[model samples]
Target: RPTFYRQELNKTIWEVPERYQNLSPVGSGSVCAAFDTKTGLRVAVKKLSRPFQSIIHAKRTYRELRLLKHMKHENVIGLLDVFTPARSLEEFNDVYLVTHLMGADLNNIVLTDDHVQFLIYQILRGLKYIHSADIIHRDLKPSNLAVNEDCELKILDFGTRWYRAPEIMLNWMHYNQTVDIWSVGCIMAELLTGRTLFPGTDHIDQLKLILRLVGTPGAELLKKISSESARNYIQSLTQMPKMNFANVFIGANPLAVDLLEKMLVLDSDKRITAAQALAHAYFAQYHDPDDEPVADPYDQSFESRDLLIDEWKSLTYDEVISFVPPP
Candidate 1:
């Protein structure tokens, strides 16, 4: 592991906890560390790398900080503190934000049969909340969301703000929340499989994966988007048989399978909103005590009440800290 000198830590001007233990890496978000402080506060700190490839990634990180600031909900990850450095390790400098560590992401727990259903419900609830506001969580895959204690799921990673609706993909000036819905649909598919439905490496591959699962994109749908690259990418994906998630889960609860199918809809317009989805028959039927999966977080160190789902009423960039709990 690379060592960060006290001078470098001080250069960033963060109040380092007197007794903080570095935990483990969070995932591909570049950098992350967990700490069990002397105060018994369990916290996870994430630092965005400043390796400059393009200004877009840098701008998006700032955008995530700004947008996440206002979100205060049980299912959304909270931003605890923001530290800036006058001098950084690199010429381009990085920003470090503190967030409360929850359990592993849904990706980590989907394989565990103990409470997968409950975790899925929690994810849907969070996604529904994000959709209610005009904000879209562009990255909706499993790795982006984690399971806290009690198997509650929270969504993280807001770096892909560039994707807009089909219209905005062209001009870069206008994007709607539909693209985000599309991601949710894809994630729904992933949750059912415990693997990413669209595990594409690039734009073209992603489009191909999407097209393979859904029908081929009609010329009209392709023409609506302004970006030639995006439109061409769509053109390259071949049409194939539609994927039926319900049929795949033969012995699983029918209602749960039904919900996944609805969420995985191809048409953004037809895709259900979070509010509407909450009232879907699938949730009403399967989320009952009889069908909801049971799992509990180990009583290792912490307990705190979750925030109201509507906490992001008037979001400000700095308000992201209120959602999480100490480690």
Candidate 2:
């Protein structure tokens, strides 16, 4: 079920080092890459494997570029440039995007307790910045967060598919930033325990996993919701304290435990924001006491990013359709 996008986009040349020409597959997800040369710069070229799944995925790629272009934060990943008229090994015409290569994903490092705490705080910083921009990362799992050789956190996978909230899942057509928060919580739990917090084989199994961990939702909560599947699923689960990490990891910090609990709440209404999360007792202790307070993470120069945006400019639904092949 992997979707690809190799044509319908642009491309460029980079003079990469001979070794880098063979990019040692660095990312997780349904993507592939190859070496390319243009001008004096070196770059890794990427393409989607499945190019005809749905127009929505292509649009989501556009959304990700649009959002990432404007967002500037050390904790978040940066989009360098995009490629169009690109050709994959499969040789399909498509679009390709070039971003800075991170050393590894969060999945590679969320092992120790200190790493877990550090990871959670860093992820929260990213979420806060995203929400500040009125955007929701939607997909906040470990695999989405990339880390350089120095372990610097860079949030990846800005596509809209990751942002599918409860509303979107049931075809309700509503979405928002809270979806990112949900992912941060899930990712923290996963990285801390070195496993998926929601290990569902399918959509129903996924929901069931969350239900077991968070407990069932109250019948009244979804009583008015017309979507029976969503309603029935929520009402069936119960909410209670489940600090799954404590059982396996000894000497786990209290601050982290507290923050993780709040993040994984079943009631999305009660979910904490990056701003509020920073103020939480869990993260407060980790705050660099000597650091100065800043109003927003993206307070940097958006104007400087104009070039990046121009390169990844979003395409309207019509522009996207125009690029599709006439199968």
Best by TM-score: 2
lDDT (C-alpha, whole model) for all candidates: 0.53, 0.54
Quote the positional error of residue 317 for candidate 1 in Å. 12
Whole-model lDDT, model 1: 0.53
Q: For candidate 2, what is the lDDT?
A: 0.54
> Tell me, what's the RMSD of every candidate?
10.3, 9.4
How close to the true structure is residue 183 of candidate 2, measured as C-alpha lDDT?
Answer: 76
Per-residue lDDT of 151-259 in model 2, one digit per residue for the tens? 6787776652322334444455454667677777667666666666666665666665665666565554455467777666665556544446555334557666667
Could you give candidate 1's per-residue lDDT for residues 217-291 as a string of tens digits?
A: 665555556778665655655656666665666665676666656655555555666655566665553343432
Best-fitting candidate, scored by lDDT: 2
RMSD of 1: 10.3
Candidate 2 Cα deviation (angstroms), residue 106: 1.7
**Candidate 1 worst ten-residue window by lDDT:** 294-303
Provide TM-scores for the models: 0.64, 0.65
